[PDB]
Structures are given as structure tokens and as C-alpha cells.
Amino acid sequence: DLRLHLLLNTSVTCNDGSPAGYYLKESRGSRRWLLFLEGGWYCFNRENCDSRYDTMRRLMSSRDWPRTRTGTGILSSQPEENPYWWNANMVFIPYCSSDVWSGASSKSEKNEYAFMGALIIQEVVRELLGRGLSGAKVLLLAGSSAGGTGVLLNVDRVAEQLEKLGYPAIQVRGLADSGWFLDNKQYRHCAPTEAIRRGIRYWNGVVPERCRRQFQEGEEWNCFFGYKVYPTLRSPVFVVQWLFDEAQLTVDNVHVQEGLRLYIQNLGRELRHTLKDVPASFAPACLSHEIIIRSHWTDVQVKGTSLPRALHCWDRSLHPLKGCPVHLVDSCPWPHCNPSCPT
Numbered sequence: 001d002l003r004l005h006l007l008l009n010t011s012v013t014c015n016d017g018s019p020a021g022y023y024l025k026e027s028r029g030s031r032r033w034l035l036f037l038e039g040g041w042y043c044f045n046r047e048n049c050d051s052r053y054d055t056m057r058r059l060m061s062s063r064d065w066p067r068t069r070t071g072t073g074i075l076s077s078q079p080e081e082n083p084y085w086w087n088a089n090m091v092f093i094p095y096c097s098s099d100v101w102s103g104a105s106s107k108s109e110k111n112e113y114a115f116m117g118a119l120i121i122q123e124v125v126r127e128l129l130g131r132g133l134s135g136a137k138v139l140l141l142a143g144s145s146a147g148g149t150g151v152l153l154n155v156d157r158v159a160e161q162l163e164k165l166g167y168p169a170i171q172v173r174g175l176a177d178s179g180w181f182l183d184n185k186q187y188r189h190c191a192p193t194e195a196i197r198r199g200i201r202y203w204n205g206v207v208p209e210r211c212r213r214q215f216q217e218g219e220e221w222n223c224f225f226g227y228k229v230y231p232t233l234r235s236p237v238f239v240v241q242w243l244f245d246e247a248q249l250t251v252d253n254v255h256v257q258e259g260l261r262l263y264i265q266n267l268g269r270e271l272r273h274t275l276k277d278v279p280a281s282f283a284p285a286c287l288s289h290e291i292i293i294r295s296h297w298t299d300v301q302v303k304g305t306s307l308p309r310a311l312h313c314w315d316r317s318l319h320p321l322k323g324c325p326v327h328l329v330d331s332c333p334w335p336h337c338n339p340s341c342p343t
């Protein structure tokens with residue numbers, strides 16, 4: 001079990017001003033730290049944030065969080081469930097900022113909600129350094145869905161933060177699961193480009209600096225899209241992405257005749273194309289959503305290699321490897337053409 005710690009700096013808050021926090025299970029003797037960013041969509045205006053506060057309040061507030069959580073999948077400490085990093089120090093950072101982990105705005109007389117996702121990550125890292133993170137060799141910032149996009153937005157900032165704080169020996173790496181979206185046309189006619197454009201202003205959202213310098217003012221929304229922000233990043237990032245991610249299909253208004261068949265096949269081909277030059281990636285041809293904290297995350301394989309194996313091969317690559325691949329993208333063109341897809 002991972003134990004809840006609310007942030008000691010209580011000015012770093014969830015949406016409603018309650019303290020943000022993290023769940024931690026230490027593994028003394030291990031110098032590996034896994035910091036996982038939870039996902040769960042976002043909200044981009046007062047009206048839809050108010051609705052989320054009414055019926056998805058755990059994603060906006062710490063008031064009702066449990067004292068403990070069980071680590072599952074990549075957060076499991078049992079080697080049978082987690083062949084990759086079962087002995088690591090485990091951190092689960094709840095998503096309570098509704099801002100794709102991009103915000104740096106406090107609740108004030110002008111703001112009903114605080115959007116502090118980027119500051120939550122920074123403050124968790126700061127407080128962990130006094131709890132053993134100062135001794136780390138590798139900090140893997142991982143996350144699923146909105147948390148996977150959060151990895152892409154924040155991994156280089158964590159790296160810069162540790163450098164400026166005087167810890168140049170901690171290797172910061174990213175694992176982005178189900179957070180690699182396409183700004184494509186919907187199958188039938190608020191879409192991700194517009195949602196994030198509004199969100200950035202509403203959240204005071206921040207993006208990685210090199211990507212910001214490319215797209216410039218008013219165009220920072222581009223940096224929320226994996227294929228645009230990834231080439232600007234310096235930290236090693238492993239990308240896990242279903243080719244037919246259910247959240248991608250939802251925003252595309254897809255829920256089979258020729259037009260839809262062509263749409264779905266083109267979507268998979270486009271996603272495959274965006275991963276061609278991503279050397280550490282795992283992209284199975286499945287219709288599904290998230291993977292890495294599911295207990296059966298071990299079961300899916302691409303080209304005969306599981307994700308825990310691919311991640312282990314990635315670790316070795318950061319010390320091509322014989323029989324230990326790190327770039328695993330399905331080429332078959334329809335959901336479940338990979339027999340190991342989740343049922």
C-alpha cells in the first residue's frame with residue numbers, strides 16, 4: 001500500500017483549494033523512483049468545471065481522498081504483477097487540477113478554481129527530496145491519459161528543477177501512456193484543439209520552453225500534442241499508445257461501413273506515422289484506454305514482446321540490443337488485429 005501525504009506547502013492546491021498530495025511507498029535500498037501522474041480528462045470553463053465538481057469531485061479536491069491506495073500494474077511491488085520495477089520507490093500523484101498537469105494559477109478573488117498541476121509536480125518532487133529522492137539514480141515520471149500528456153509537458157521541467165536544486169546525478173526520464181493525441185478532423189462534427197486553447201487561458205497553462213519558443217504566443221496549445229512537443233524534449237521519453245485509443249475516438253465522435261472503416265484505418269496509420277521516429281515506444285493495434293497501472297498490463301505484446309520487457313530493454317539501452325527491443329509499433333491496420341489486445 002501507498003500512504004497519503006498532503007503537501008506541506010498548503011498553497012499548492014487542488015481545484016477547490018484543498019491541499020494537493022501524493023501517495024508513497026518507499027523501497028529502502030532502491031535508488032529508482034517512479035512518480036505516476038493520474039489522468040481523467042480536464043475542464044476548461046466555469047460551467048463544465050462546476051459540473052465536474054459535482055460528480056467527479058475526487059478529481060478536483062483532496063477532501064475525500066483515502067489514507068492509502070494499493071499500487072497496481074507498474075506501481076505494484078510484486079514482481080509477478082510488475083516484472084519491470086517492482087522494487088522501486090512508488091509514488092502516485094492524484095490528478096486534482098483538471099488542467100492536463102499544465103496549470104500554474106491559484107484560487108483568488110478572480111478565480112473560482114485553482115489550476116496548479118505543473119506546480120503540484122514541482123512541489124511533490126521538492127518534498128520527496130527530503131524523503132530519499134535526493135539519493136535517486138533514476139526518476140521515472142510516468143502517467144496515463146491526461147497524466148501521460150502531463151509527462152510530456154513536465155518531464156523537462158522536473159529535470160531542470162533537479163539541476164537547479166543541485167542534483168545533477170538524478171536521471172529524469174518520462175513514460176507517457178495514452179497521452180499521445182492527434183489534432184485530427186472528427187469523423188462527424190468542443191474538439192481537443194479548441195478545448196486546450198480555452199483551457200490554457202483558463203488555467204494559465206504552461207508548456208515546455210523549447211516547444212513554446214517554436215509555436216509562440218497564442219499557439220501554445222500545439223505543445224499538448226505528443227508528436228509536436230516530443231521532438232523538443234531533452235529527457236528520454238518512452239511512449240505507450242494504443243493505435244485506436246478510446247479517448248481519441250471519443251473526441252473524434254466515433255462510437256461498420258466504408259466511410260468509418262476508412263476513417264479508423266487512417267487514424268491508425270497516422271498514429272503509426274507519428275511514432276516512426278520515436279525510438280522507445282509501445283503501440284499496439286487495439287481499441288482500449290490506458291494500460292500501465294492495470295493489474296494485467298503484463299499481458300499485451302507487440303511482435304512477441306511485452307511492455308514490462310520493452311521498458312526493461314529501455315533501461316538497458318540507457319546504461320540496438322540483441323533480443324531486447326525498445327521500438328514496438330504494430331503495423332496491422334484494424335483494432336484487435338493483435339491477438340493480445342485487452343478483452
Ligand SMILES: COC(=O)c1cc2c(s1)-c1ccccc1OC2
Pocket residue numbers: 039040041042100145146147149181192196224225247248251
Ligand atoms: C481520459 O481521457 C483523457 O484524460 C484525455 C483526453 C484527451 C486529452 S487527455 C488530450 C490531451 C492533450 C491533447 C489532446 C487531448 O485530447 C483528448
Ligand SMILES: *[C@@H]1O[C@H](CO)[C@@H](O)[C@H](O)[C@H]1NC(C)=O
Pocket residue numbers: 009011012119123
Ligand atoms: C509554496 O508554493 C508556492 C507556489 O508553488 C511557492 O510560490 C512558494 O514559494 C512555496 N513556499 C514554500 C515555503 O515552499
